[PDB]
Each structure stands twice: as structure tokens, then as C-alpha cells.
């Protein structure tokens, strides 16, 4: 616990709650430093709920909608992993340093501007803060501190969701992080063209083509191993290797970035709620020098970086460049440098890495049992036993990637398309959830419209979703603009957040701007656009044939009329069901 780095933030919080501040001698924190406590003080989308009655009795759908916060913390966040051996550490540094240099070959780091940040907040209480000059003054005071060598307010607010913990920060802390490290996103350092293995900037509509491209590279099976709680396994050594990017920055920019890396990444201070007696609630103040603070501006890019480093190392272990003697200490580094310069880029191209999600196509199946460095780095695989060899896939269409699987389908004319797919319950369940209280029928209907148009663009091949989306679009006024967000994923490019005709938008995305679509002939009607095969639609959770779903479909126009009565019969509506 570096008090000379975290003390100022702790004193600032203590001053703001001096009368209630206490030190709970019986706090539950084991692997987090405890500093003290103080006395601190979802909804359904009715439109989507009304048009999806068969999914009220489906637990896979309804399940999506301080006691719960502490549960997530004690189980997956309050853990400590042993440090990797010295040789593992030298290998991680060497590959990270090689990777930053490859990524920086055709790109130079740069500072991101106040106006770039504002153009971002206007694109996606929140909008009023950047328009107020008092916010930019607080930002300026915190930057002053950062350049001197201190931090007062870059403090996290942790919210547990019972699965994962989401770490919040005030808009000001995120602007400062964006200013110094946002260039990784804005300039696509993790884009496929620049990184080889990255997929940043590609929509879910292109990810299948990436996997299909990888399936054609000679080698072993495709491996898609998830790491159990990736963000909680980011070690202090991963953070120092990620911060090597500062060596490519000019002094001024370097000072801003080193401050972010020191206070937001490497010496975190966090506020967390905890249930107290007589229904009362406390806020604890805790600190940690490792783990990823999930939900931060460059979380995705940095996770992508470290994941590419982990897969290059696993491939080096598999190819026998690294042996079990290299874990304890790496005596000769020359073999690693030679493997990176000769094979580095070829191995990057055999990967698709999106944050903590990866698919690797190795040169043979020795990759399945190359686990010694993977386990020494603390990157333990999900659900499987630590030393049980990984199971790879033969069919790229069955490979999991970004919570999806990809399928080749055929248009009525014979052209093939590669579509994203996932279990329907997850999609319907997510669309039934509305974030925000006091929500007007307009905002709820507009969010419903965004979900329906997203389904039309990406999940058009699911029979239930095509029907449900058309009923939503028939119940919401035509001129009402879609609002909100249907996903947090960087693969959600929001082409559906528009009032442009969805068949025109489908054509732009699947035909015109699809490089994997050779023949550019437009598709002029929805019936030309295919569904999955009944067996596959059923496997991924379809209710086609199921009695309540059939009644739902038979009564759908009546249901649409009821929603139109509630929104208002004076509004203008289009019938997308006919
Ligand atoms: Zn700060
Ligand atoms: Zn599927």
C-alpha cells in the first residue's frame, strides 16, 4: 500500500465525510488494503414486454432483469494470484516491448482533445456537464495536480452485479484518461490492419469472415479458451508491460500518461457499499495495486494488447522455443527475439483477439498442451482443469467468439453470407430491460425500436426475432428516432440507430460495404434474406412450433394495435408485418 501515492485521495474523501468517518475493525477485506468507512445514503421496457408474452415463462429471458455487491466482491474480486516466475516475467516484457514497437511502426501516439471528447459525448446529467465551464475547470485543477505528481479525485466507484463488478469514475477522471491514452481507440492501434490479431473497429457483421479466413490457414484446430475472470487476473507485471507505450510519447504527453498509469491503473482507490445493521449502509474505502479497473476508457485496448502477448507466448511454448527451464529464468533471450522477428506477424494473423476473448489457429495441436506459461502468468482457463489439454474446434461455425457463433447462409439468388448468432433468450431478455427511471413512453418505445432494428440488421435469420422486430417497428411511430444503446460491445457500430429504411441499411452493410460479398447486386426484398435452418434456429432457442409462440404469432396484429392505442392512434404507423 503506497501511502505516498494514495493518501491524498483518501484524505479528500475523509474531509468530505469527516463527521461520519469511522474505521470498521471488522471489515471483510482480505486481499484489498482497507482505509476506513463512512455512512453513505432493473425496470422493464413495457413496449418489448407487451410484444413478447411467450418469453414471460422463460427463465433464460426473465433472469436478465449492497448485499449483492459484496457477494460479487468476496468471490471474484477479493483474490490474490502468485507472481509469475522471473523467466516468465522477462518473456512477458520482451514480447510486450516487441508488440508495442510493431503497433507503433505506422502510428505515433498523440494527446486527445477536449473537442474530441465532447464530439464523443454528443454522439452517444451527462450531456450538460461538458457544456458547463465549471466541469472543465475541475478537470484543469486535477491535471495541475497530475503534472506536479499528485492525485486528488481519480477514485473508482465499484458496483457489483450478481457475475462481474463494474467500476465507475466521474466524467472528469475519464476525460483525463482519454486525453492521455485515448489515441489507442481513436487511431485504431488494435485494428486488424495495424495489429494482425486485433478486430477493433469491425462490426459483429464481419467477425464471422475473420474466423472463416482463419479456418483456411494451415495448422491445428481453432482454439477459443476463455480466462476465468480476466480482469481480476491482470497482474502488476501486466500493468508495467502495458505502460511501455509511454516510451513512444513525447515528454509532455508522457507526463500526462504516466500520471494516469500511476493513479488509475497501478494504485487504485475504490469506494464500495456494504450492508450495515438496522438496514443502514456504509461505504468502505479500499486500495489495490493490480487487476484491471473494468469499464475504463482504454480497458478494451489494453486487454487486447495483453491477450495478444499471452497468445504469442503460448505459441512459443507450443513450438518448443520456450522450455520449462525458461520459466525460472530466461538465460538466452536471442531465440525469443528471432522467433518474434521471423514468425511474430504470421502468428498475429492466426488470431482474432477482442479484449479478453480470443480464437487462435496454431501451426499444429501442440498448442492444446502448452499450458506451463499460461498457468504461471495467472491466465487460468475457464471451466476446465488447469492441466487438462484445451479442446479445439474443427468447424469454425461452432467456435465461440464475443458471445457469438457464426454461420454461413445463402441468399435466394445463391450468394453466401456469414451471420452472427447467439441463444435467442439472451437477446430477448436484453431488449426487455430498460435503464432509467421516470422514462416516458417515447424513450421506452425508441429503445425498443433500436433493439428491433438491430435484430433486423444482425439477427434477421432468427424466425422469432424477425417477427418480433417487425411487430415492434409496426407499433412505434415511423418518425420517432431510435435512442439508447442495445449493447456495450465495441462491435456494435449502431447502423440501426436511424430512421433510414432498414432494408437500405441492410444492403449497405451486407452487400455494398461487405468486402467478402463479391457480387454487389442489391437485395430488393426481405423474403430474399434467409433464416437459419429449422434445426439450427431451434438449437439456438427458437420457439417456432411451440404452442404459446404460435398463438403469439397468430394474434400479433391485435397486439400491435393495442400498443398503437397506448402510444396514440393520432401517430403515423407502418405495417412491417404484411
Ligand atoms: Zn487524479
Ligand atoms: Zn446459433
Amino acid at each position: 500500500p503506497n501511502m505516498k501515492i494514495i493518501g491524498n485521495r483518501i484524505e479528500r474523501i475523509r474531509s468530505e465525510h469527516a463527521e461520519t468517518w469511522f474505521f470498521d475493525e471488522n471489515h471483510p477485506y482480505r486481499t484489498w488494503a482497507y482505509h476506513g468507512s463512512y455512512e453513505a445514503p432493473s425496470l422493464i421496457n413495457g413496449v418489448v414486454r407487451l410484444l413478447s408474452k411467450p418469453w414471460d415463462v422463460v427463465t433464460g429471458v426473465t433472469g436478465i432483469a449492497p448485499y449483492g455487491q459484496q457477494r460479487v466482491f468476496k468471490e471474484k474480486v477479493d483474490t490474490r494470484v502468485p507472481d509469475p516466475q522471473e523467466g516468465t516475467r522477462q518473456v512477458m516484457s520482451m514480447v510486450s516491448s516487441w508488440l508495442w514497437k510493431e503497433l507503433g511502426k505506422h502510428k505515433r501516439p498523440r494527446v486527445c482533445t477536449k473537442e474530441e471528447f465532447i464530439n464523443k459525448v454528443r454522439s452517444n446529467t451527462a450531456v450538460e456537464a461538458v457544456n458547463d465551464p465549471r466541469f472543465w475547470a475541475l478537470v484543469d485543477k486535477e491535471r495541475e495536480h497530475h503534472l506536479r505528481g499528485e492525485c486528488q479525485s481519480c477514485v473508482y466507484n465499484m458496483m457489483g452485479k450478481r457475475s462481474r463488478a463494474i467500476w465507475y469514475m466521474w466524467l472528469g477522471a475519464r476525460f483525463l484518461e482519454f486525453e492521455a491514452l485515448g489515441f489507442l481507440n481513436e487511431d485504431h492501434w488494435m485494428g486488424r490492419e495495424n495489429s494482425g490479431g486485433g478486430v477493433e473497429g469491425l462490426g459483429l457483421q464481419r467477425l464471422g469472415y475473420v474466423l472463416e479466413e482463419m479456418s483456411r490457414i494451415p495448422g491445428g484446430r481453432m482454439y477459443a479458451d476463455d480466462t476465468a475472470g480476466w480482469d481480476t487476473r491482470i497482474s502488476r507485471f501486466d500493468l508495467e508491460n502495458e505502460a511501455l507505450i509511454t516510451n513512444q510519447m513525447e515528454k509532455g504527453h508522457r507526463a500526462l500518461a504516466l500520471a494516469i498509469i500511476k493513479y488509475t491503473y497501478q494504485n487504485k482507490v475504490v469506494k464500495v457499499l456494504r450492508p450495515a445493521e438496522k438496514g443502514k449502509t456504509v461505504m468502505d474505502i479500499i486500495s489495490r495495486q493490480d487487476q484491471r479497473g473494468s469499464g475504463q476508457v482504454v480497458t478494451y485496448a489494453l486487454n487486447t494488447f495483453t491477450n495478444l502477448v499471452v497468445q504469442l507466448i503460448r505459441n512459443m511454448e507450443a513450438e518448443e522455443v520456450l522450455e520449462m527451464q525458461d520459466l525460472w529464468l530466461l538465460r538466452r533471450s536471442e531465440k525469443v527475439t528471432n522467433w518474434l522477428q521471423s514468425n511474430g506477424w504470421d502468428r498475429l494473423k492466426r488470431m482474432a483477439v477482442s479484449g479478453d476473448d480470443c480464437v487462435v489457429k496454431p501451426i499444429d495441436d501442440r498448442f492444446a498442451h502448452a499450458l506451463r506459461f499460461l498457468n504461471d502468468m495467472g491466465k487460468v482457463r475457464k471451466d476446465t482443469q488447469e492441466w487438462k489439454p484445451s479442446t479445439g474446434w474443427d468447424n469454425w461455425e461452432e467456435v465461440p467468439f464475443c458471445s457469438h457463433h457464426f454461420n454461413k447462409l445463402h441468399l435466394k439468388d445463391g450468394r453466401s453470407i456469414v451471420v452472427p448468432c447467439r441463444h435467442q433468450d439472451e437477446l430477448i431478455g436484453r431488449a426487455r430491460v430498460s435503464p432509467g427511471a421516470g422514462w416516458s413512453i417515447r424513450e421506452t418505445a425508441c429503445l425498443a425500436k433500436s433493439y428491433a432494428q438491430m435484430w433486423q440488421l444482425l439477427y434477421f435469420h432468427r424466425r422469432d426475432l424477425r417477427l418480433m422486430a417487425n411487430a415492434i417497428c409496426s407499433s412505434v411511430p415511423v418518425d420517432w428516432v431510435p435512442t439508447g444503446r442495445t449493447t456495450w460491445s465495441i462491435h456494435g457500430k449502431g447502423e440501426w440507430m436511424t430512421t433510414e429504411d432498414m432494408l437500405v441499411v441492410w444492403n449497405r452493410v451486407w452487400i455494398e460495404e461487405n468486402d467478402h460479398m463479391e457480387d454487389k447486386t442489391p437485395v430488393t426484398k426481405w423474403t430474399d434474406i434467409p433464416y437459419l435452418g429449422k434445426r439450427e434456429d431451434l438449437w439456438c432457442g427458437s420457439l417456432i412450433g411451440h404452442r404459446p409462440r404460435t398463438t403469439w404469432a397468430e394474434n400479433i396484429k391485435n397486439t400491435v394495435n393495442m400498443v398503437r392505442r397506448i402510444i396514440g392512434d393520432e401517430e403515423k404507423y407502418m405495417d412491417y408485418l404484411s
Side-chain angles (χ1 to χ4, degrees):
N2 209 303
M3 290 308 300
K4 293 179 184 192
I5 290 175
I6 73 177
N8 306 304
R9 276 170 283 171
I10 295 179
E11 278 305 286
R12 169 76 78 173
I13 299 166
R14 188 177 296 198
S15 87
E16 293 168 54
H17 305 97
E19 278 306 296
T20 52
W21 183 268
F22 69 105
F23 194 98
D24 197 322
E25 185 186 270
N26 299 314
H27 67 80
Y29 306 106
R30 313 244 287 112
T31 73
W32 281 71
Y34 174 73
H35 299 293
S37 321
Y38 75 83
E39 310 164 8
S42 71
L43 285 188
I44 293 293
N45 186 303
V47 168
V48 182
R49 203 205 82 239
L50 280 172
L51 301 151
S52 56
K53 219 175 85 182
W55 294 269
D56 273 72
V57 299
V58 176
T59 74
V61 169
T62 52
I64 312 298
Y67 174 68
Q69 297 202 197
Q70 277 296 296
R71 210 86 164 269
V72 170
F73 200 94
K74 194 69 163 291
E75 278 107 79
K76 21 192 95 284
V77 190
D78 204 22
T79 50
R80 184 156 301 280
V81 184
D83 296 347
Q85 302 198 334
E86 191 171 48
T88 305
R89 268 145 49 187
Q90 307 167 266
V91 171
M92 276 155 61
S93 293
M94 277 189 74
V95 175
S96 303
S97 163
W98 176 89
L99 198 48
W100 281 127
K101 285 160 199 197
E102 291 296 291
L103 300 177
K105 224 179 108 167
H106 309 293
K107 290 191 188 283
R108 295 301 175 273
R110 68 174 182 91
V111 177
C112 284
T113 73
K114 171 177 168 169
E115 297 78 20
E116 270 177 302
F117 187 74
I118 292 172
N119 290 0
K120 267 217 167 298
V121 310
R122 302 254 177 88
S123 302
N124 49 6
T125 310
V127 53
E128 305 179 318
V130 304
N131 305 144
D132 207 297
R134 205 140 172 89
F135 163 77
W136 298 104
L138 287 191
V139 153
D140 259 302
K141 183 195 186 200
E142 189 63 355
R143 193 199 287 108
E144 279 214 294
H145 288 304
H146 284 186
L147 296 183
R148 277 181 292 190
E150 63 185 336
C151 187
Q152 302 247 259
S153 56
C154 300
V155 55
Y156 286 101
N157 258 102
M158 194 181 292
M159 284 202 66
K161 292 304 292 185
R162 192 179 66 115
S163 164
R164 84 241 153 104
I166 178 175
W167 313 34
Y168 293 92
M169 236 168 196
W170 75 293
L171 195 63
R174 305 243 170 273
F175 168 70
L176 286 177
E177 174 191 352
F178 167 78
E179 162 178 82
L181 299 156
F183 67 96
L184 300 157
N185 305 323
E186 308 313 283
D187 293 319
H188 317 281
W189 280 56
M190 313 302 168
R192 202 142 187 94
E193 298 96 324
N194 199 56
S195 61
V199 297
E200 193 273 314
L202 287 181
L204 187 69
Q205 66 264 29
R206 307 286 175 254
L207 298 184
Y209 291 112
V210 167
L211 301 184
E212 181 187 26
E213 270 172 346
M214 283 161 61
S215 71
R216 297 189 283 243
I217 316 183
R221 313 193 141 86
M222 283 162 77
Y223 291 88
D225 295 328
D226 259 351
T227 295
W230 169 270
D231 286 356
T232 74
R233 305 295 187 125
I234 288 304
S235 69
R236 85 187 182 90
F237 310 99
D238 285 333
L239 298 175
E240 296 167 2
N241 293 334
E242 274 157 23
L244 290 167
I245 183 53
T246 59
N247 297 325
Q248 295 185 53
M249 308 181 171
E250 57 97 13
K251 303 240 65 207
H253 178 198
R254 185 180 282 152
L256 294 170
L258 287 165
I260 297 305
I261 291 160
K262 188 191 284 288
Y263 311 120
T264 294
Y265 310 160
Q266 300 187 353
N267 296 271
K268 301 178 289 302
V269 168
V270 186
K271 278 197 178 109
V272 190
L273 290 177
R274 166 154 60 88
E277 298 172 270
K278 286 278 163 45
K280 278 100 77 228
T281 324
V282 314
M283 179 81 74
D284 306 319
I285 308 305
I286 57 178
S287 82
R288 188 62 110 96
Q289 299 178 87
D290 71 357
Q291 298 194 0
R292 177 82 70 212
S294 326
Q296 89 208 346
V297 182
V298 305
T299 296
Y300 174 86
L302 298 183
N303 285 336
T304 301
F305 182 81
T306 302
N307 213 4
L308 292 164
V309 164
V310 170
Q311 310 303 325
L312 287 171
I313 294 174
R314 187 169 175 183
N315 273 289
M316 254 183 298
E317 201 204 315
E319 290 165 46
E320 296 176 33
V321 171
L322 293 175
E323 39 175 0
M324 52 166 194
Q325 304 97 89
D326 300 319
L327 278 173
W328 175 257
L329 164 80
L330 188 78
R331 299 145 163 103
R332 356 163 302 274
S333 68
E334 313 80 42
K335 262 221 79 182
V336 170
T337 302
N338 182 56
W339 186 90
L340 292 161
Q341 309 283 12
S342 312
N343 307 304
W345 262 86
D346 179 272
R347 307 297 190 270
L348 288 171
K349 292 200 291 304
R350 296 164 166 275
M351 291 176 204
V353 184
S354 191
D356 65 334
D357 263 25
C358 72
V359 180
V360 174
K361 186 65 155 79
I363 68 172
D364 50 71
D365 290 295
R366 288 180 298 180
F367 191 87
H369 57 258
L371 298 167
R372 311 193 81 135
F373 278 84
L374 183 72
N375 297 321
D376 197 52
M377 288 185 287
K379 303 296 178 279
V380 180
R381 297 154 308 153
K382 215 178 232 83
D383 317 299
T384 82
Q385 209 239 239
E386 198 161 318
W387 299 91
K388 182 189 189 288
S390 297
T391 297
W393 274 270
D394 286 286
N395 184 12
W396 65 269
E397 291 185 62
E398 292 166 31
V399 162
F401 189 49
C402 297
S403 285
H404 288 84
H405 53 272
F406 300 88
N407 296 139
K408 196 183 262 191
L409 292 190
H410 296 278
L411 292 185
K412 191 186 86 77
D413 49 67
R415 286 177 295 173
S416 55
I417 49 172
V418 178
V419 309
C421 193
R422 67 180 301 179
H423 199 280
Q424 224 172 236
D425 297 345
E426 311 172 339
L427 289 165
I428 289 159
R430 185 52 158 79
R432 279 161 69 112
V433 166
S434 179
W439 264 37
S440 172
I441 195 66
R442 177 134 185 166
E443 305 310 334
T444 284
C446 287
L447 182 47
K449 192 167 167 162
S450 313
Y451 272 105
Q453 301 197 161
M454 181 189 61
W455 295 350
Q456 281 168 346
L457 184 61
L458 300 161
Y459 310 109
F460 48 85
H461 52 90
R462 308 304 310 280
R463 284 157 188 83
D464 299 348
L465 301 188
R466 199 188 288 200
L467 183 64
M468 201 191 295
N470 278 336
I472 293 160
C473 292
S474 298
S475 319
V476 177
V478 271
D479 66 311
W480 282 18
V481 174
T483 66
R485 75 160 71 252
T486 63
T487 177
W488 282 113
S489 177
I490 205 175
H491 301 290
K493 308 192 79 54
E495 299 93 335
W496 57 86
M497 300 291 301
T498 188
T499 56
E500 183 167 26
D501 190 275
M502 277 323 293
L503 183 56
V504 167
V505 174
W506 192 93
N507 261 274
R508 186 169 307 120
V509 168
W510 291 99
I511 310 291
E512 179 178 52
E513 299 166 355
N514 181 2
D515 300 332
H516 296 89
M517 181 54 82
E518 189 181 84
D519 174 4
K520 300 308 195 192
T521 305
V523 166
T524 57
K525 67 199 172 300
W526 283 103
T527 55
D528 283 354
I529 300 163
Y531 288 125
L532 283 181
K534 250 170 218 226
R535 200 171 283 221
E536 287 76 14
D537 206 352
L538 285 165
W539 184 257
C540 292
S542 191
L543 302 192
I544 189 74
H546 184 48
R547 173 56 57 192
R549 186 265 188 212
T550 309
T551 302
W552 166 76
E554 282 156 5
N555 292 344
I556 204 67
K557 302 213 302 310
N558 185 246
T559 313
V560 168
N561 283 339
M562 164 194 65
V563 178
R564 286 187 179 167
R565 205 167 297 126
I566 306 165
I567 295 173
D569 283 340
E570 67 281 348
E571 300 292 342
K572 179 68 171 327
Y573 299 100
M574 174 69 48
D575 190 0
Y576 299 97
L577 290 157
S578 52

